[PDB]
Amino acid sequence: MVTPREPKKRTTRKKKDPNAPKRALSAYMFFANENRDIVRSENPDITFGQVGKKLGEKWKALTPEEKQPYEAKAQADKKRYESEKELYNATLA
Question: Residue 67 to residues 15, 18, 24, 52: CA-CA distances in angstroms?
Answer without folding.
Answer: 33, 31, 16, 17
